[PDB]
Point group: none
Chain length 161, copies 2
């Protein structure tokens, strides 16, 4: 049911944080779309902070979901989960130890986010960007960013500005 | 894992099992339909039923699933190997759960002697707190890893701790009540 918040989007995926708030990685946005989820793009408040993209819709879209806590990365050392969906239908949760917060240049673009190391040492692939990183803090799920890059165990979670 | 692996996992009794080859099916002993007269259309007395504790292997006298190629079956994996537990749920989900395979040992579970290999799920900090682990109904799903170009199946899901990441993979040759055929 957390999985139902992860939806194919452009060349990756994105995640419904609340009925009106959808997050994704900026580089996967389909650049020739006129609307997202049936809403003309110019009616959506689309904020890009490097590779972290927030789409705020003018009316609720996913009214079946509750609003989830969204934070800017996690404490260093947190074992988060990257919730990968694949176009075969698989739901592949991967633990990742979160590390340093930084602003980097990746393929010439500025990317604010947090590094992680997958605990598989079973990894990420083209098509996976925009999938969410989450962790559990007490009784609360916390979403901390979106998948943006990985070494060909290092992954990069883009985080809000 | 490729779809040709997933299609080998089918419901069986109160859990699941896995077609290793067209004639060879593995599952967890405790999920098997009790008092069944046939499996997959074959009378029980015509099947070679091997049990090693909670690992159960059914060998059929002719090919059943002629669409599958034969896969290497080994008795667990080396300690430290990262495998995938391929979970299917009755709600339709396909959930590959990464697991680091640990020590081979023999457990006593619900009064039964259950040999196998302990594993640690690598899906989150605490798989159970996050609903990213295993649950009743998941037994018999396979643990599989890739060694070079070859997939290797190492056993079947049999048990897991009520919290945290520990899972138990029952293996061929493991300790427990045994039958040769």
């Amino acid at each position: 049911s957390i999985w139902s918040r992860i939806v194919n989007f452009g060349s990756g995926w994105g995640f419904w944080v609340s009925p009106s708030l959808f997050i994704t990685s900026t580089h996967v946005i389909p650049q020739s779309a006129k609307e997202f989820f049936g809403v003309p793009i110019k009616q959506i408040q689309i904020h890009k902070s490097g590779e972290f993209c927030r789409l705020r819709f003018p009316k609720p879209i996913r009214t079946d979901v509750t609003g989830m806590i969204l934070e800017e990365g996690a404490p260093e050392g947190t074992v988060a989960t990257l919730l990968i969906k694949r176009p075969t239908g698989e739901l592949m949760p991967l633990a990742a130890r979160m590390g340093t917060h930084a602003t980097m240049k990746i393929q010439g673009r500025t990317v604010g986010g947090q590094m992680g190391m997958l605990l598989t040492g079973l990894g990420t692939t083209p098509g996976d960007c925009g999938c969410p990183y989450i962790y559990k803090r007490g009784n609360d799920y916390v979403v901390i960013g979106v998948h943006t890059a990985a070494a060909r165990n290092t992954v990069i979670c883009a985080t809000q500005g």
